[PDB]
């Protein structure tokens, strides 16, 4: 009930890929944007735009490449 342990990470696969390639402070802003997205206070296009700005194209490509080589389902 308090601080539960689960094999699956609460954060999504996309976030996990970026998290391992980005600073924790930077993720704070990303996480904040995510809350806005969940609250529908942010447009999805805006989220992607901001996400791309935060991660950078050089990181987005790496994330995309990782996702392509991700044989999990």
mmCIF file of C-alpha atoms in Angstrom:
data_model
loop_
_atom_site.group_PDB
_atom_site.id
_atom_site.type_symbol
_atom_site.label_atom_id
_atom_site.label_comp_id
_atom_site.label_asym_id
_atom_site.label_seq_id
_atom_site.Cartn_x
_atom_site.Cartn_y
_atom_site.Cartn_z
ATOM 1 C CA UNK A 1 0.000 0.000 0.000
ATOM 2 C CA UNK A 2 2.885 2.312 0.783
ATOM 3 C CA UNK A 3 5.781 2.293 -1.671
ATOM 4 C CA UNK A 4 4.708 -0.832 -3.504
ATOM 5 C CA UNK A 5 7.183 -3.073 -5.256
ATOM 6 C CA UNK A 6 6.357 -4.280 -8.730
ATOM 7 C CA UNK A 7 8.549 -5.748 -11.455
ATOM 8 C CA UNK A 8 6.947 -3.497 -14.028
ATOM 9 C CA UNK A 9 8.121 0.083 -13.861
ATOM 10 C CA UNK A 10 5.316 2.607 -13.470
ATOM 11 C CA UNK A 11 6.892 4.861 -16.063
ATOM 12 C CA UNK A 12 6.339 3.925 -19.676
ATOM 13 C CA UNK A 13 8.857 2.298 -21.984
ATOM 14 C CA UNK A 14 9.364 5.543 -23.894
ATOM 15 C CA UNK A 15 10.070 7.476 -20.694
ATOM 16 C CA UNK A 16 12.351 4.706 -19.475
ATOM 17 C CA UNK A 17 14.420 4.966 -22.656
ATOM 18 C CA UNK A 18 14.767 8.734 -22.306
ATOM 19 C CA UNK A 19 15.261 8.558 -18.530
ATOM 20 C CA UNK A 20 18.382 6.449 -18.977
ATOM 21 C CA UNK A 21 19.633 9.022 -21.477
ATOM 22 C CA UNK A 22 18.638 12.221 -19.692
ATOM 23 C CA UNK A 23 19.346 14.056 -16.457
ATOM 24 C CA UNK A 24 16.966 13.506 -13.561
ATOM 25 C CA UNK A 25 16.324 17.244 -13.262
ATOM 26 C CA UNK A 26 15.380 17.340 -16.928
ATOM 27 C CA UNK A 27 12.987 14.453 -16.311
ATOM 28 C CA UNK A 28 11.313 16.543 -13.611
ATOM 29 C CA UNK A 29 10.131 18.939 -16.281
ATOM 30 C CA UNK A 30 9.203 16.055 -18.558
ATOM 31 C CA UNK A 31 7.255 14.434 -15.727
ATOM 32 C CA UNK A 32 5.534 17.750 -15.021
ATOM 33 C CA UNK A 33 4.539 17.978 -18.679
ATOM 34 C CA UNK A 34 3.261 14.410 -18.480
ATOM 35 C CA UNK A 35 0.944 15.407 -15.633
ATOM 36 C CA UNK A 36 -0.335 18.266 -17.785
ATOM 37 C CA UNK A 37 -0.863 15.792 -20.616
ATOM 38 C CA UNK A 38 -2.733 13.409 -18.300
ATOM 39 C CA UNK A 39 -4.845 16.277 -17.004
ATOM 40 C CA UNK A 40 -5.431 17.141 -20.666
ATOM 41 C CA UNK A 41 -3.899 20.532 -20.040
ATOM 42 C CA UNK A 42 -1.395 19.876 -22.784
ATOM 43 C CA UNK A 43 -2.025 18.902 -26.393
ATOM 44 C CA UNK A 44 -0.401 15.648 -27.509
ATOM 45 C CA UNK A 45 1.334 17.470 -30.355
ATOM 46 C CA UNK A 46 2.635 19.999 -27.849
ATOM 47 C CA UNK A 47 3.821 17.170 -25.617
ATOM 48 C CA UNK A 48 5.742 15.550 -28.463
ATOM 49 C CA UNK A 49 7.097 18.941 -29.516
ATOM 50 C CA UNK A 50 8.273 19.691 -25.995
ATOM 51 C CA UNK A 51 9.501 16.126 -25.547
ATOM 52 C CA UNK A 52 11.560 16.386 -28.731
ATOM 53 C CA UNK A 53 12.941 19.709 -27.524
ATOM 54 C CA UNK A 54 13.822 18.193 -24.151
ATOM 55 C CA UNK A 55 15.353 14.954 -25.400
ATOM 56 C CA UNK A 56 16.800 16.444 -28.585
ATOM 57 C CA UNK A 57 16.605 14.907 -32.045
ATOM 58 C CA UNK A 58 19.944 13.173 -31.422
ATOM 59 C CA UNK A 59 18.291 11.496 -28.442
ATOM 60 C CA UNK A 60 14.937 10.933 -30.099
ATOM 61 C CA UNK A 61 16.635 8.978 -32.865
ATOM 62 C CA UNK A 62 18.429 6.910 -30.234
ATOM 63 C CA UNK A 63 15.120 6.285 -28.463
ATOM 64 C CA UNK A 64 13.431 5.406 -31.754
ATOM 65 C CA UNK A 65 16.325 3.123 -32.633
ATOM 66 C CA UNK A 66 16.049 1.460 -29.226
ATOM 67 C CA UNK A 67 12.293 1.065 -29.663
ATOM 68 C CA UNK A 68 12.866 -0.504 -33.078
ATOM 69 C CA UNK A 69 15.248 -2.987 -31.489
ATOM 70 C CA UNK A 70 12.852 -3.809 -28.683
ATOM 71 C CA UNK A 71 11.501 -7.310 -29.083
ATOM 72 C CA UNK A 72 9.079 -7.187 -26.189
ATOM 73 C CA UNK A 73 5.332 -7.594 -26.209
#
